């Protein structure tokens, strides 16, 4: 209010404004969420009733990571306001892929590794993001670091079946499409396979339900056999046939990853 200098609207991008924290000129994003539009609510450690998004953001925002950090939040009469970290300079991964086309595998490896580490961090914090996609990934173009955003479709991580989902349908697995259910981890691995294909091919593999359930991955771009193999494994139709995060990260295609700064110097600067 007096704490923040409010700049322009960032980015059908909800209501997120550029901001500067007054105390120390920190770049922030100021995200407004209408109470009437929130379906999932939770309670904080002290029983303050808040949107689930706030609960999940607090759980992941302790320490450094590839997750955007919630710095503060406020309740207003008809909304919640969320103060989030803002890297600068930044571009989201969707626009990056649109402008550059299919990524070199070296770059895709670095990015994909970082998303994997970020999603492991969420899972270690008891959080399932449920909307892993290029649009929800920011690239810090100077540091070469990726940041996961928008926990508005997320849930507490659990080992039992999920029967609700409001993420992005084209990144959702066939068990969701066909049966209206999924397990968190295996569904996340499906969406990571869609993302990896998107990176190395320049667009997602499936647009329609029939393609999602079909179990057929055609490569439009030149992609190494090892990368093709990892993608097809992540997109196994049967959830139990998909790799664990450990198996992904030990896959031959994932060896010799660049550091974020190396990535920035080679591909972004």
């Amino acid at each position: 209010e007096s704490q923040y200098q409010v700049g322009p609207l960032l980015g059908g991008f909800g209501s997120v404004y550029s901001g500067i924290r007054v105390s120390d000129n920190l770049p922030v994003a100021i995200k407004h969420v209408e109470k009437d539009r929130i379906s999932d609510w939770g309670e904080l450690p002290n029983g303050t009733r808040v949107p689930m998004e706030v609960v999940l953001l607090k759980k992941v925002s302790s320490g450094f990571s590839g997750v955007i950090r919630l710095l503060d939040w406020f309740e207003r009469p008809d909304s919640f306001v969320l103060i989030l970290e803002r890297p600068e300079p930044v571009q989201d991964l969707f626009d990056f892929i649109t402008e550059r086309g299919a990524l070199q595998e070296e770059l895709a490896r670095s990015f994909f590794w970082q998303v994997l580490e970020a999603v492991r961090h969420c899972h270690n914090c008891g959080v399932l993001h449920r909307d892993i996609k290029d649009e929800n990934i920011l690239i810090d173009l100077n540091r070469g670091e990726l940041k996961l955003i928008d926990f508005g479709s997320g849930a507490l991580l659990k080992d039992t079946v999920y029967t609700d989902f409001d993420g992005t349908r084209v990144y959702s697995p066939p068990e969701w499409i066909r049966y209206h259910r999924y397990h968190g981890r295996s569904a996340a691995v499906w969406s990571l396979g869609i993302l990896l294909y998107d990176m190395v091919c320049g667009d997602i593999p499936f647009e329609h339900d029939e393609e999602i359930i079909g179990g057929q991955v055609f490569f439009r771009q030149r992609v190494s056999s090892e990368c093709q193999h990892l993608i097809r494994w992540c997109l196994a139709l049967r959830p139990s046939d998909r790799p664990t995060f450990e198996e992904i990260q030990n896959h031959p295609w994932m060896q010799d990853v660049l550091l974020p700064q190396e990535t920035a110097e080679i591909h972004l600067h």
């Binding site: 649109t98 909307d131 996609k133 649009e135 993420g167 992005t168 990144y171 667009d203």
Partner: peptide, 8 residues
């Protein structure tokens, strides 16, 4: 096929 965003 146009590359497009997809809402949640």
């Amino acid at each position: 096929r146009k590359r497009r965003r997809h809402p949640s």
